[PDB]
Amino acid sequence: YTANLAAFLTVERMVSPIESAEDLSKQTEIAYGTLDSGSTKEFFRRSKIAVFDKMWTYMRSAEPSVFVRTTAEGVARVRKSKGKYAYLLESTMNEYIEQRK
């Protein structure tokens, strides 16, 4: 009994996911995606950075589709995925939804 209790404490003591772009690209439980047509998706397409090209090749072939039609659907999916989904977008719109109910 005392042996099983210490395992779960250490798994969560790992504190995941940490805040970064690569930690989001390293695990696939909590999936992630962007917008279908816009300056956000085209960013990862022609990115010659190893960390970002990895994120592109994931989402370019991530199934089910991690993309969305509009931005209103993207915020609604992060809420109903129980934290198993993340959304990438500009920092401006990201900071206004955090300050709206």
Partner: protein
């Protein structure tokens, strides 16, 4: 690999699952009821001798 669903990072320590089981609980019981039935196989011979 890239088009693969089970990605090369899906097996690279992706998740840390954990849950206690009763899987091997038997082994311990697997030796005491054999003693509860043995302490009972030797007890009934001391209340008569």
């Amino acid at each position: 690999y890239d088009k693969g669903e089970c990605g090369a990072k899906d097996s690279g320590s992706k998740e840390k699952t954990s849950a206690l089981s009763l899987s091997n609980v038997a082994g311990v019981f697997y030796i005491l009821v054999g003693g509860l039935g043995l302490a009972m196989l030797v007890a009934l011979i001391e209340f008569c001798y």
